[PDB]
Write a protein that binds this ligand. Structure first.
Ligand SMILES: Nc1ncnc2c1ncn2[C@@H]1O[C@H](COP(=O)(O)OC2CCCC2)[C@@H](O)[C@H]1O
Ligand SMILES: Nc1ncnc2c1ncn2[C@@H]1O[C@H](COP(=O)(O)OC2CCCC2)[C@@H](O)[C@H]1O
Ligand SMILES: Nc1ncnc2c1ncn2[C@@H]1O[C@H](COP(=O)(O)OC2CCCC2)[C@@H](O)[C@H]1O
Lengths: 635, 646, 658
């Protein structure tokens, strides 16, 4: 075999996990939407791609969403000029599909499980309460003069009103631009100024991990260089005294108290911008295509059912919260989780106390969280029930098989489907993932593309498609899909240069990928992070997976630098578990052998640096420029 | 019987008036008896009433986009929804669709202050003038949702201003012509409107209203008003501020006579109407329009060729609903009466009916008591057979005035519909259907479609089930035309109507349901007087006083008394003919107190009676009892009362 | 016969031209939509007029355009108060019907044949390319804050992006106000200020006939007195260095490169204004959306017998209404190919039109009598040796086509195998009002023939105001009822709208033209009523006399006007241009003026002979092509000259008359 799966301590033949009992409609669990085998996935997937897929997408579009005006055309446009259209003649409102229609059917159903930073302060937020709070905010924005198409920045932590802020903008046709509450005043400034918003929504302070986020302090600093912000809505989250600029700044509760608890929905066109999410690339998503994509993926990738309680542990400052905390779940009318704390506050058992308390049916987090909890021991999880869960999802980066097994062993008790969901902020929704009721998973493989995704592997040098299996290269998409980002706000040139120009005719994700002998897709990491040693292209996940196979390795990050013998050299930055006593033990040799043993001599790191902890909310570009979190520069 | 009807000189058994011949079978919409009213009413309330309202909504109004949901929300948080997904335009349903069917049909009977200047305004003429004004507003930058203040007298173009705002999706805020510069100021500043429509001068009762003069004074303290449209009503020279002020006729001559209709959502605000801080009551589009359309059709048994005469002003909700939106929504002829009931003489109302053959008349007890005060010579020698229904609104109509209305104006051949409602209800809430309900003088009778009201004991706070009960009036469920909020003050909206009795809407009136199920509105809860644990209503005492020969108008209030808790103080106005020099003032006040003792009881006898020439009232006609209460309590037409009491 | 056709050298009996074979569905040409005879035109026309025509218009409205929301009422309003309504409850978007729906069907089909001033720089613009550029400009306009209902002035030459600028404004619901590229800074200034636009679209420089149009220079001068214009979008047409005002002025390409290539369509109501077109105070003619779009679509389809694969070539400019209706909206609404001709008829040579036809296989041609008379003045070498068989229909617009020029058109341009459609209408009619349907009507040189669908026209005595029933009658032209494409107002001046067209003859629309209906029912437009000359109580029309003069060998173009005469009331004065080869030295001018005056006396009558004739090199004309007779009238007797093409001619005329 030319394509090698990610290094795992378990042999290959023992590493195929079929849909487990809970995903078979047994043990009181509902029937999956797609099952029972791979063939059932292909039967349905084949309808969503190719020349006869307008019928399927038109039906799913009209069955999944409530429309004000029906659409005539299904799709149009393409990558070349960035004019992708989906259901253009149709009109709808995202807030209507995520709130109103569910409020009209069951007003008392819980929409949001607000898991506060402190476990006792948690509570359920019904669709009625959330709709009221959203219409109040919408009415406040309209009183500030926010019109259809105006940008509104959101700088809110993971409190339940953050969904009301999002949907308040969507309800009136405003483009919300969410900014993670941990971002600095300098980062916020850049995003508030780029979107040219005139209104900003934020908190007095945020609460995460028992520590205070000085949000209103961070806003006041940024706004000194944001001349366009005239109105700032401040939610009273902590109540601590914060500066309030008279005239500009108003309190959420006081403003909403003046407005009615209903607000009419603006009739939006499918291609009206729904939100900007800065990554700075202000990635722009439309309404219908994005909403439909997030709705379908949640239903099928997480096998969501009406009475399910979906728990996505991301932040609404990232696309994961946009798609799989707010728009996706609420569009399907189920319960979604707004988790305000960290995975290790008050203790590393928080995720599991949370599931058992609410009987969560699915969990969705990142490899960074999984590897963190793995470094903290199985005592915080071994003594839990967790039988409510049926599907466990991972997103953000390649999940090392060791973490995948840790995930499957303890969190799922070997009875949950593990969905490795690959996608980007620009894809809008999950692009490659196993349907839990049909796909047998391989640790660290996103498996097969989702409905509407037709992806190929291309040789980056020649630009030629590699037909068949056992191939490796860069990942691309053949055709647009509904939830694809439509542009980069006021920088369409950068939108085309980044995703459409490198390989004309396709969408360029920026990831190296490989399709193994069985057809499973393997995402190996960013193309920029690849290392070419003696003409052999090493992927970042391949080497890092081997290092964590060594007992005591907690997290790694390999980067390259030009070597005067091999072209490029592998340099490693390794974090050890807290128990590995580096005073008694002199290790860097045992790790390099681990690479030489599992990968090959060419992959052996030329130098290894043992470090205590750069990451986002892993910055390998930082590690590259250093060799070419100040401890890294010192070590 | 525990619940007592309003004192009447006619004994009870002789005081039930069945639907008279004119309201008998062409055919009324609901008839011929009470059961015919209940069979239909039952469809409009309860858990199975969506079918009826969905049908009525789609049959009564033209929609751009149909609605999916019928109703949602409730009182608790003030999120009432009706037909939310639907879209429509008020101007389209009041003008366009009728212009398309019969453009030459008369929409407005403009009865000018001088009878000779009257004329008919067709739907074509009204629609053109409405599109012209709408085109002017759009040229000023008025967008959907922007507030526009209207300060116009009772000239027919006032309907054009209303519907012009509704046509483009602007929220008009009408202010009664004659309010001071200060009252206007507060309403213009609260709604934050950037455009104001008014006249050069108004004409009412042979007197000139200096509207533009009052506007210029107010705008000195209204910084947001950039454009003022001035209608040339009299032509007398008035100041015009360059840039800000433009002439109605000159502006409209630049614009086309058609304007596209803004596609409004059911719950988009239609107008703000401030009540005498100033409470800006807000009404939506679909629910309000439907309510005013249905009530007009069923409460006044309106048919296509009728000529509806509501003698109110467009500055009050009565003019909003039953001069403009209600009648014109049904596509009939409506009256814009610019004069007073007594100009040139007290025969004006009746000269008006016979001139135009009015089929219904709608006015207030304050006007009825006025004509009663002016003698029956001005009405006895008129025909008035065109009328089928006579309506009363604003406050309880004493049975003494009810009979005068019934005897002379209707010649005992018209149904008398006592219509109870408020600005916040949008449309008539309790009233007898004239083709089905037998009336009692001073009784609103039974609730309208969509209104399910109960009596609640204010002490216990519990609903009193059954008949022969008395308490405070409340509604069980929202209805389409209910006000949606108070402009930029939703808290005051909830605290005033929804929080006092959670789960219900609190009107603010004491009411009683007699042994037959008839509802009796006895006056404001604030006006109730607690004498030794007995709650006296203002209607009970004032009705007894006007029964005494010579009494023109009365108003009783309460004040802190030691032995009985509160004491009843009376302010009585005598007819101008009453020789108060020949009769002793003490002898008269004694006969009045005994009159109260005879029909109500000893506890109701006024501790002191004050003979005054006139009582302080608002411009809508309501009597200002709060003022009389604070004056008697020593907490300093108002200079005469404070001086006489001393 | 009382009504006389325009003087023609061909006798009458030899002057009836039936639909030729190319218009009969033979030779493989498509079948006409209406044919084959007059009875077939009236059969369909009668459905479009009177009180029983709502069914037809509702069906055509729903068959011709894609609607977001359907309409309930078909028509309402009238002339009296200027409240004309058509399909009011309906909603649609012009850009959607001219671009989107055609992009969705065949994105690679050519929408615009861009014939640049230089033939080599020409190319085809697909519906995909035009839609993308239109959505980009719309997105730029939205980024400038342009809202539904805002005016946007366009000062663009005849480059294909002018269609993108138009449709970008319509796409977002903006009212574009086009001004012909070449108007002075003063004419532009007055039009930018009247529409109160805050955005202006223009080029750095224009190119027409090998000459440079200093568009940005004229814009910079005009905007010095236009305080409301905050943003100027400048298209890079030539690339020559032009002044750019920092902040205000931005480059089309740089701005569009920042925006996506798709933009949602604004849902416009039928009666929302689509554009303002000022005519030479400035008269801002306003057109609505649905009715205008329907009219331009139907007229193009039926007056030019347009079929899906046709290549329509309207040689006008988007600065006047002919380009609005029969370069952009009409053709693109039908989803066919249209031509953006940037040059002149004689650049590089007078063979350009014909090089153009054979180059692109144009299926129809649409130009003005001034262009036809120009090419006739330049000799048959430039046209005789061309194929031109792609053509099936040849159109004339702007003024009466003299029978002499009509024959030249029919003989050389059509090689006696094309239908000649003389299309009468005004900027205020929106679309062609009177014209022969080429597959059904047999034509007479210089006759607009019969009214188009929705047009019911009468002849009225201008003095008595009475309708002249029947045939062989003469008077002034009026319309009985509103039609879909009729102008709805004059921008912010509805008073001038009513006083000009609705008040003169209450109950009708007053075109301002003298007309006559001959014994056969054919309509004859005789010229402006203002241009009529009263000689001894005889009402002379400008078309009959000018047609008579051009019958004289050597005459290129003429223009007669009226003047105060002390004996006959008014006297006929003539301005005649001879072909360049005509030796005015060998032939005596006084002898020519005698032969011309006799030519007029022989065909018309003694009263029609010009009292004085002036030989001039050219005439004062506008860019639309109609001769400015008011200028010649006021000069002869001893003010709205914005469209004056060559102001130099007025100085030669003022010298040659004094
Ligand atoms: N399952 C996965 N397996 C391997 N790589 C993965 C996987 N999910 C994400 N990635 C990497 O994340 C980038 C995009 O991240 P971003 O769009 O910034 O954040 C978004 C990403 C999804 C939610 C937050 C991809 O281009 C990849 O490199
Ligand atoms: N038929 C009636 N019988 C007894 N009382 C009545 C009756 N009609 C009104 N009222 C009192 O008027 C208030 C409302 O006043 P307002 O807000 O001006 O509403 C407008 C609505 C029409 C004119 C007043 C009620 O709440 C009552 O107190
Ligand atoms: N076929 C024709 N036969 C005789 N006269 C005609 C003909 N077409 C136009 N006209 C005269 O042009 C005026 C309108 O000019 P304009 O407003 O520019 O409209 C534009 C619309 C087309 C180009 C001019 C008419 O009122 C007439 O006088």
């Amino acid at each position: 075999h030319h394509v090698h799966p990610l290094p795992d301590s378990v042999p290959e033949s023992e590493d195929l996990f079929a849909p487990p009992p809970r995903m078979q409609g047994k043990e009181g669990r509902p029937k999956p939407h797609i099952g029972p085998n791979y063939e059932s996935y292909v039967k349905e997937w084949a309808k969503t791609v190719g020349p006869n897929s307008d019928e399927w997408w038109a039906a799913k579009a009209r069955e999944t969403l409530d429309w004000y005006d029906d659409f005539k055309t299904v799709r149009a446009g393409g990558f070349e000029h960035g004019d992708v259209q989906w259901f253009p003649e149709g009109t709808l409102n995202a807030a209507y599909n995520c709130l109103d229609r569910h409020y009209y059917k069951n007003p008392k159903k819980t929409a949001i499980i607000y898991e506060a930073d402190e476990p006792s302060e948690s509570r359920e937020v019904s669709y009625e309460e959330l709709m009221q709070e959203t219409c109040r905010v919408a009415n406040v924005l309209k009183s500030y003069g926010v019109k259809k198409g105006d940008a509104v920045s959101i700088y809110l932590p993971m409190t339940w009103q953050a969904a009301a802020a999002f949907l308040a903008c969507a309800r009136i046709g405003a483009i919300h631009s969410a900014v993670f509450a941990g971002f600095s005043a300098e980062s916020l400034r850049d995003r508030v100024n780029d979107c040219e918003c005139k209104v900003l929504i934020t908190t007095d302070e945020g609460r995460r991990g028992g520590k205070t986020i000085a949000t209103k302090q961070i806003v006041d600093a940024a706004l000194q260089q944001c001349p366009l912000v005239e109105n700032v809505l401040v939610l009273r989250r902590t109540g601590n005294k914060v500066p309030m600029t008279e005239g500009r700044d108003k309190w959420w509760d006081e403003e909403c108290a003046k407005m009615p608890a209903y607000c009419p929905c603006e009739r939006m066109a499918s291609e009206d911008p729904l939100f900007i999410l800065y990554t700075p690339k202000g990635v722009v998503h439309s309404t219908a295509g994005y909403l439909l994509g997030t709705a379908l993926t949640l239903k099928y990738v997480f096998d969501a059912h009406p009475d399910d309680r979906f728990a996505c542990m991301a932040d609404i400052g990232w696309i994961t919260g946009h798609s799989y905390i707010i728009y996706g779940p609420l569009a399907n009318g189920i319960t979604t989780a707004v988790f305000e704390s960290t995975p290790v506050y008050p203790t590393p058992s928080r995720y599991w106390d949370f599931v058992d308390k609410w009987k969560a049916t699915q969990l969705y987090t990142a490899p960074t969280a999984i590897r963190l909890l793995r470094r903290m021991g199985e005592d915080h999880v071994k003594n839990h029930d967790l039988s409510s869960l049926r599907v466990l999802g991972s997103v953000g980066e390649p999940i090392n098989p060791e973490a995948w097994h840790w995930y499957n062993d303890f969190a799922g008790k070997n009875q949950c489907a593990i969905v490795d969901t690959y996608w980007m902020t620009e894809t809008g929704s999950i692009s490659i993932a196993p349907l839990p009721g049909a796909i047998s998973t391989k640790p660290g493989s996103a498996t097969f593309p989702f409905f509407g995704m037709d992806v190929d592997i291309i040789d980056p040098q020649t630009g030629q498609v590699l037909e068949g299996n056992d191939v490796e290269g860069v990942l691309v998409a053949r055709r647009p899909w509904p939830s694809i980002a439509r542009t980069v706000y006021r920088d369409h040139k950068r939108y085309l240069e980044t995703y459409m120009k490198p390989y004309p005719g396709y969408f360029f994700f920026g990831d190296g990928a490989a399709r193994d002998y069985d057809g499973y897709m393997w995402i190996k990491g960013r193309v920029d992070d690849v290392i070419n040693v003696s003409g052999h292209r090493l992927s970042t996940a391949e080497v890092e997976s081997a290092l964590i196979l060594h007992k005591g390795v907690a997290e790694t990050a390999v980067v390259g630098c030009a070597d005067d013998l091999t072209g490029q050299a592998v340099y490693a930055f390794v974090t050890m578990k807290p128990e590995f006593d580096l005073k008694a033990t002199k290790l860097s040799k045992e790790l390099a052998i681990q690479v030489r043993k599992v990968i090959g001599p060419f992959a052996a790191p030329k130098k290894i640096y043992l470090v205590s902890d750069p990451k986002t909310r892993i910055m390998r570009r930082v590690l590259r420029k250093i060799v070419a979190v100040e401890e890294v520069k010192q070590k």
